[PDB]
Design a protein around this ligand. Structure first.
Ligand SMILES: Nc1ncnc2c1ncn2[C@@H]1O[C@H](COP(=O)(O)OP(=O)(O)NP(=O)(O)O)[C@@H](O)[C@H]1O
Ligand SMILES: [Ca+2]
Ligand SMILES: [Ca+2]
Ligand SMILES: [Mg+2]
Lengths: 152, 362
């Protein structure tokens, strides 16, 4: 099997990136994101990307999944912005929440032109980079209910 | 409005509604016609298997009988799910490296025959990766017809590194049918093949060390298992239990010179940029029914460790519901309004025709 004349001949192209950039324009959560240095946090709630109030940043429900966008000045230019996007997966988050967090992390990457570097942060396996965003972390029992309907 | 998710496997249809945690209809992708030489679909063909010859309209992930595939889709909508397809945006799945005409005809039939309002054709392995909650990893997907490796980095598949093998569950079933004759048991017909498939799913396993396991099986009966046939006859199977899926690691068992699944996985990783291989090695995700053999994850871990640098962390992820990971990833993505924004609408199809599928579905 070769790529030519196949259904992956358009993967990796400018057209793929164009189509996905356009799709990311339809998520209200990204409007105004990554405009200044700081940490922005959303939680997945029944497939939706919901902002977390600033006063609660750093507290994470073990039952839930989150997207954390860290905006900072890169070494190359003190007046420009670079991005780390972490998605945080609670020990008890459900499969719909983690999958949506993963997909929407890519979408936020798309929205920001591919610049963000992505980090998968499972509870108990959080990277040094992630830990350093909260100089700390507070894990809370509970979380919001799955968006899945359970097929009996 | 609820989207339909239809994972059209070579062997099984998995169909249901976006937002559900599992497919509501799972049935064999078969059309049956009288063995004595007007048709039956799915479970009802399996129900009349005694008088029918069974044909699969998908071979190695490619639709080769479009008339019978239409029957399968019609059965899925009207007889199983009991929905009107013109009311439901529909997500379909496909193996990577299929010829472009396959999804062109998928799109044509969905819009012109079933009048769906919108549709999308997704690469199965990408859906499995998201179902596992990852954006980076390498999926080994193995069903009834296709085994493929797709490495994915930050949500984008790396097309130059995608690997595909025409060796999957149906070949393993056929091989089990053949070697069960060395023991005296005759399985030859399309009906008998489904009995052997069941033996395979219930009793086979991947040996951690194939040579040692063959010697264990020759020394005593400790690895033998009994299996009750429909007529009540109890047969005994021994080294066939692990010789059958050994073929995935040694394709020469069925006369193929191909690399085994451990080598194709390694080779796929090695076609990726050096600095991301680390993340692929630590995130090998298994997907599909032919990855359900007991022992397969441990064997993959052993074999990849032998091929990879000694300092490399290797991890095989084997989700317990991986028979349905592709479908579940589809259920998640089809629940997202931004993903559905990318779908082909009927108006867009009326303007552009089948070629639009390649400009919208990635
Ligand atoms: N427990 C099991 N152990 C081994 N094989 C199994 C098991 N359960 C199912 N299978 C095989 O898995 C295959 C069906 O898996 P599935 O992932 O549904 O394939 P598919 O999607 O229909 N085909 P494909 O077009 O290749 O993706 C058949 O060959 C089954 O016999
Ligand atoms: Ca939750
Ligand atoms: Ca990026
Ligand atoms: Mg499949």
């Amino acid at each position: 099997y070769n790529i030519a004349d196949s259904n992956i001949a358009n993967l990796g192209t400018e057209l793929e990136k164009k189509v996905k950039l356009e799709a990311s324009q339809h998520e209200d959560a990204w409007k105004g994101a990554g405009k200044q240095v700081g940490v922005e946090i959303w939680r997945i709630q029944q497939f939706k990307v919901v902002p977390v109030p600033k006063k609660h940043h750093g507290s994470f429900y073990t039952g839930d999944s989150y997207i954390v966008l860290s905006t900072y000045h890169p070494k190359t230019n003190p007046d420009k912005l670079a991005y780390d996007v972490h998605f945080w997966l609670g020990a008890f988050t459900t499969q719909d929440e983690a999958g949506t967090a993963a997909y929407k992390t890519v979408e936020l990457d798309d929205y920001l032109g591919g610049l963000p570097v992505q980090y998968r942060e499972v509870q108990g396996y959080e990277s040094e980079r992630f830990l350093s965003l909260f100089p700390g972390l507070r894990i809370l029992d509970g979380g919001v209910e799955t968006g899945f309907h359970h097929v009996e | 409005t609820t989207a339909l998710v239809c994972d059209n496997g070579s062997g099984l249809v998995k169909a249901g509604f976006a937002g559900d945690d599992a497919p509501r209809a799972v049935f064999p992708s078969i059309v049956g016609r009288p063995r004595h030489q007007d048709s039956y679909v799915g479970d009802e063909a399996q129900s009349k298997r005694g008088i029918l010859t069974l044909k699969y309209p998908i071979e190695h992930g490619i639709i080769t009988n479009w008339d019978d595939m239409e029957k399968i889709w019609h059965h899925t909508f009207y007889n199983e799910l009991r929905v009107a397809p013109e009311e439901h945006p529909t997500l379909l799945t496909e193996a990577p490296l299929n010829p472009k005409a396959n999804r062109e005809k998928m799109t044509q039939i969905m819009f012109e025959t079933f009048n769906v309002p919108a549709m999308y054709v997704a690469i199965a392995a990408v859906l499995s990766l998201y179902a596992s909650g990852r954006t980076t990893g390498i999926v080994l997907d193995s069903g009834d017809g296709v085994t493929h490796n797709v490495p994915i980095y930050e949500g984008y598949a790396l097309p130059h590194a995608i690997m595909r093998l025409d060796l999957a569950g149906r070949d393993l079933t056929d091989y089990l049918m053949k070697i069960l004759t060395e023991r005296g048991y005759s399985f030859v017909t399309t009906a008998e093949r489904e009995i052997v498939r069941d033996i395979k799913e219930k009793l086979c396993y991947v040996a951690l060390d194939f040579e040692n396991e063959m010697a264990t099986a020759a020394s005593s009966s400790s690895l033998e298992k009994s299996y009750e046939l429909p007529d009540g006859q109890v047969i005994t199977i021994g080294n066939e239990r692990f010789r059958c899926p050994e073929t995935l690691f040694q394709p020469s068992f069925i006369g193929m010179e191909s690399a085994g699944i451990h080598e194709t996985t390694y080779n796929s990783i090695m076609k990726c940029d050096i600095d991301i291989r680390k993340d692929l090695y630590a995130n090998n995700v298994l997907s599909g029914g032919t990855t359900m053999y007991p022992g397969i994850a441990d064997r993959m871990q052993k074999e990849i460790t032998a091929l990879a640098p000694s300092t490399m962390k290797i991890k095989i992820i084997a989700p317990p519901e991986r028979k349905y990971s592709v479908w579940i990833g589809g259920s998640i993505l089809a629940s997202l309004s931004t993903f559905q924004q990318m779908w082909i609408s009927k108006q867009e199809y009326d303007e552009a025709g089948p070629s639009i599928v390649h400009r919208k579905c990635f």
